[PDB]
Amino acid sequence: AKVQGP
Amino acid sequence: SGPGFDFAQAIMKKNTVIARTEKGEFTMLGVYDRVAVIPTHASVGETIYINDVETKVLDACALRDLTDTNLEITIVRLDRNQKFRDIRHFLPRYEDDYNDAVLSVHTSKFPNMYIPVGQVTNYGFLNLGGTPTHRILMYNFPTRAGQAGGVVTTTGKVIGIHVGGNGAQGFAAMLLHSYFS
Amino acid sequence: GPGFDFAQAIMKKNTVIARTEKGEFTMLGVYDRVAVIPTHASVGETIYINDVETKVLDACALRDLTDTNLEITIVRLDRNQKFRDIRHFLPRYEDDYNDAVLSVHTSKFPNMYIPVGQVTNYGFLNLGGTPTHRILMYNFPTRAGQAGGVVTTTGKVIGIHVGGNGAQGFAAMLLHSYFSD
């Protein structure tokens, strides 16, 4: 998984 | 079902603001008083824009568990006059799986987004962008960047906030009542 | 928001859950007892409308002047309720759009509202081996079960979802001339 912020 | 969609709408209308940090816009969930949460990778600073209003960060705490492992939840105390409706009684008390969950996001990029993500399953571990993270929930929906901070709910339960994905699945950090005792 | 409030009004007042031998579809009522559904639904002599078997008075799979498929099937339903006339919300000509919302409502995707943003007049598209015209294209990771979803913008109902290819979604245009006069 990868952080999905802006 | 309408109850779930209605509950999500209520949570978004009364207990969410658009938080903007140096990293961009995030969906921010207000829990009680002047306390709110945001994914830790948002890099909260001394100031944060709350619906385009510069707000002083009275305090911030990046949550980690007994093993000193990242939980990806940052609790923030905001210098505001408005007080969040206390929703701590909607927070689960322990780790669990859920059905018919909804992911709700509100930013300038994703205004008023509501996604029925279906079954939600808890895992003790996730390698989130290289950072070991614990107390994770997974759902089978292709979430995308800009949805971090999005609120995960079932009818009467606010169970987590979105933190990441892998292209086919989404992952949320879990909200527990004991975090806001 | 402006898009969400309009989209929800169209969903609540002018959509039903249609079920054919191919499964559940979002179906948009346009006026009188006339509704639209993606042609790949393979409509028949009867159809379930919100779980009530309904006689299909007429069904016409639309084609353009070049005799090319448009992937829209107009259906006249033998039901007591009459759809609110929304034909004045339909575009008059082919165009591109911004700030679009895809709204779906089925047992699998209940109360789903997705801001897809930019919508491009793609035009030609080979949809599963079937040449198709007047296709709108938006960037959204589609999933099976969203066919028939309504695509709206600020005050217009511009098309219905007909398919996708993992990262892009495709809708058939709705034009005022299809239902007018």
Numbering used by the authors:
A (entry chain C): 385 to 390
B (entry chain A): 0 to 180
C (entry chain B): 1 to 181
Give the text the authors published on this PDB structure.
During viral replication of EV68, the viral genome is translated into a single, large polyprotein comprised of structural and non-structural proteins. The viral polyprotein needs to be cleaved into individual proteins for viral replication to proceed. The 3C protease cleaves eight sites in the polyprotein with a preference for a glutamine–glycine (QG) motif at the P1/P1′ positions. The conserved essential function in viral replication makes the 3C protease a promising target for DAA development.
While the co-crystal structures of EV68-3C protease with viral substrates had remained elusive, we have solved and refined the first such co-crystal structure. Superposition of these two structures, experimental and computational, revealed a very good agreement with the converged modeled substrate peptide position, and the peptide from the experimental crystal structure fits well within the substrate envelope. However, once the peptide binds, the pocket becomes capped off, enclosing the P1 glutamine peptide in a U-shaped pocket. Specifically, the Thr142 sidechain is shifted 3.6 Å deeper into the S1 pocket, opening that area for a water molecule to coordinate with the backbones of Gln168, Gly166, and Asn165. At the same time, Thr142 is positioned closer to the P1 glutamine, enabling the Thr142 hydroxyl to form a hydrogen bond with the incoming substrate peptide. Proximal to the structural water, we observed a 4.3 Å conformational change of Arg143 to form a hydrogen bond with Gly166 that is unique to the substrate-bound structure forming the S1 pocket. Compared to the apo protease, loop 125–129 retained its overall shape but was closer to the P3 and P4 region of the substrate in the bound structure. For the substrate-bound protease, Asn126 in this loop was 0.7 Å closer to the peptide, enabling a hydrogen bond. Similarly, Gly128 was 1.3 Å closer to the P4 backbone nitrogen in the substrate-bound structure, facilitating another hydrogen bond interaction.
